[PDB]
Design a protein around this ligand. Structure first.
Ligand SMILES: c1ccc(Cn2cc(-c3c[nH]c4ncccc34)nn2)cc1
Length: 282
């Protein structure tokens, strides 16, 4: 494909070295979110690892709750990644707007994230930057998870469990990354715990005016629940926000996703056809 194969529209996101722009493919009339990277910039900033990594990770993804990579092309100066377009924006936008999700909405969107992570972890991949800003909503209001630049493919051949790069967003970073200096699949489950808490409480659990203060609270597991927090959701959060990464519900050591999906908070959930169910109105 060539850039001339598309008509570009509004900018969907501006990054430090890349931009995402809405595009319509002329020959088919389909809409894509195209991620564009300046080739000169990548070499200068040594962002190539982030770029090559992202292509290979996304090439492995084929699940309804993840952004799909449809095509990639290049011209003398730029790299283009054709991605799924999610019309309804970030999950964060809705948390801020509504303030906090009711129990039905909390359960439904938490279940979709759990289903997504079960797939991703099954493929041996750690997102490492899960947060509401990276959980988009498509036209039907189902989730689409994006931003795989920070993602890691763990090697099957050495039964790899740990990733060493320090990446992520402070409010959602796991204690093991801060103290042991490495992350694992279970690090995404810590982030899930923060996200569930945020859907109900309106803000993430560890929050402060700067990163260092946040890190200090994470390491000490210093947070509180607001009054009226749904009880079964509270129990689930307490089973995810655990300092020991081998003791989080859903992690390999705790025998995987089955026990997590079996949590009482999810009792009314039908897991199989989640992506075809009608989302509860927010
Ligand atoms: C540069 C790097 C990363 C980002 C964040 N981002 C948004 C998206 C995205 C994929 N499909 C979409 N559809 C609508 C809006 C945003 C997106 N992927 N990554 C924005 C700019």
């Amino acid at each position: 494909k060539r850039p001339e194969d598309f008509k570009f529209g509004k900018i969907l996101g501006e990054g430090s070295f890349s931009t995402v722009v809405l595009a319509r493919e002329l020959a088919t009339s389909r809409e894509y979110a195209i991620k564009i990277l300046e080739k000169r910039h990548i070499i200068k900033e040594n962002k190539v690892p982030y770029v090559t990594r992202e292509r290979d990770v996304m090439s492995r993804l084929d699940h309804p709750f993840f952004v799909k990579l449809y095509f990639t092309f290049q011209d003398d100066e730029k790299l283009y990644f054709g991605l799924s377009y999610a019309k309804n924006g970030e999950l964060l936008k809705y948390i801020r707007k509504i303030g906090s999700f009711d129990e039905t909405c909390t359960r439904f969107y938490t279940a979709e994230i759990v289903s997504a992570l079960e797939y991703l972890h099954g493929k041996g991949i750690i997102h490492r930057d899960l947060k509401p800003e990276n959980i988009l909503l498509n036209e039907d209001m189902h989730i689409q998870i994006t931003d795989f630049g920070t993602a890691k493919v763990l090697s099957p051949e050495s039964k790899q469990a740990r990733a060493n790069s320090f990446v992520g967003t402070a409010q959602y970073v796991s204690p093991e990354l801060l103290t042991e200096k490495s992350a694992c699949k279970s690090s995404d489950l810590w982030a899930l715990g923060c996200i569930i808490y945020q859907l109900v409480a309106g803000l993430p659990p560890f929050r402060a005016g700067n990163e260092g203060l946040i890190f200090a609270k994470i390491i000490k597991l210093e947070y509180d629940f607001p009054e009226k927090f749904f009880p079964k959701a509270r129990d689930l959060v307490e089973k995810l926000l655990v300092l020991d990464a081998t003791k989080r519900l859903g992690c390999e050591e705790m025998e995987g996703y089955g026990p997590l999906k079996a949590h009482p908070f999810f009792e009314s959930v039908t897991w199989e056809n989640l992506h075809q169910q009608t989302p509860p109105k927010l």
